[PDB]
Amino acid sequence: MISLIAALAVDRVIGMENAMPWNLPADLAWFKRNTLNKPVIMGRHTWESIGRPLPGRKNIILSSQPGTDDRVTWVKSVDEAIAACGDVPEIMVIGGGRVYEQFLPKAQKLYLTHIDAEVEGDTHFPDYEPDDWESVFSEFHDADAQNSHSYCFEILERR
Ligand SMILES: NC(=O)c1ccc[n+]([C@@H]2O[C@H](COP(=O)([O-])OP(=O)(O)OC[C@H]3O[C@@H](n4cnc5c(N)ncnc54)[C@H](OP(=O)(O)O)[C@@H]3O)[C@@H](O)[C@H]2O)c1
Ligand SMILES: Nc1nc(=O)c2nc(CNc3ccc(C(=O)N[C@@H](CCC(=O)O)C(=O)O)cc3)cnc2[nH]1
Ligand SMILES: [Mn+2]
Ligand SMILES: [Mn+2]
Ligand SMILES: [Mn+2]
Incomplete structure (x- = not known):
């Protein structure tokens, strides 16, 4: 099974x-709980943005060019990325925009x-078709002293 987290x-x-x-x-913290002990697939730009391997997960990086760090696994296509995960119950795709697409x-x-924050960005999550997806979990949180925006955790499953 393939899942996307964003x-x-x-x-x-x-x-x-x-x-x-x-x-x-x-x-x-939600990201870590939902990805720990699972393989994570990311694009090269997201790898550069994070800036280090994520511990406790197999890190798989998509790039058309040879890898530059043997602490992670480098692959050159979607099918190779999936194969490199092996036989696991759940593969986590962690972006960015091009990879999510x-x-x-x-x-x-x-x-x-879903974060209640306005920011002028250059990357978007894909338009997906709402009719294809069922909301199976949602949990709303007001802003607090540690989290400056309200936010909603949602899990959707393809119908
Ligand atoms: N809010 C969130 O949840 C979240 C999550 C992740 C990322 N982000 C943000 O998203 C942005 C990065 O997204 P992005 O769309 O620019 O880049 P990206 O999807 O992270 O990376 C794109 C790169 O991945 C490689 N790639 C993608 N598909 C491939 C394929 N089929 N075969 C081979 N290589 C492939 C290519 O690398 P090469 O050029 O080396 O071939 C491509 O240039 C950053 O702003 C990051 O902070 C946000
Ligand atoms: N829900 C979600 N939120 C995100 O912010 C997010 N970000 C990315 C890409 N960027 C990042 C940036 C940093 C870390 C990171 O450092 N994670 C640590 C958390 C511990 C900490 O630094 O506070 C980790 O161990 O997972 C992960 C992804 C991908 N999927 C996401 N998914
Ligand atoms: Mn192929
Ligand atoms: Mn198999
Ligand atoms: Mn806000």
Whole structure:
């Protein structure tokens, strides 16, 4: 099974200038809980944005060019990325925009954080078709002293 996990600001914005400008510790904790002990697939730009391997996960990087770091696994196509995960119950696709576009048609589950924040971005999560997806979990949180925007954790499953 392939799942996508992402955090979306208003208008499906996910990034600006190869960064995420907000800081929501509760959402990073959600990301870690839902990805730990699973393979994670990311594009090269997202690898550069994170800047280090994510511990406790097999890190698989898509790039058309040879890898530059043997602490992670480098692959050159979607099918190779999936194969490199082996026989696991759930593969996590962690972006960015171009990678999400390619994996969306193959995904059964979306883990989405909806952040009540306006930021002028250059990368968006794919337009997906709402009729294709059932919301099976949602949990709303007001802003607090640690998290400066309200946010909603949602899990959707392909109908
Ligand atoms: N809010 C969130 O949830 C979230 C999550 C992830 C990322 N982000 C943000 O998203 C942005 C990065 O997204 P992006 O769309 O620019 O880049 P991306 O999807 O991270 O990376 C694209 C790169 O991945 C490689 N690639 C993708 N598909 C491939 C394929 N089929 N075969 C081979 N290589 C392939 C290519 O690398 P080469 O050029 O080396 O061939 C391509 O240039 C940043 O702003 C980041 O902060 C946000
Ligand atoms: N829900 C969600 N939120 C995100 O912010 C997110 N970000 C990315 C891409 N960017 C990043 C940037 C940093 C870390 C990161 O450092 N994660 C640590 C959390 C511990 C911490 O630094 O506070 C991790 O171990 O997973 C992960 C992804 C991909 N999917 C996401 N999915
Ligand atoms: Mn091929
Ligand atoms: Mn197999
Ligand atoms: Mn806000």
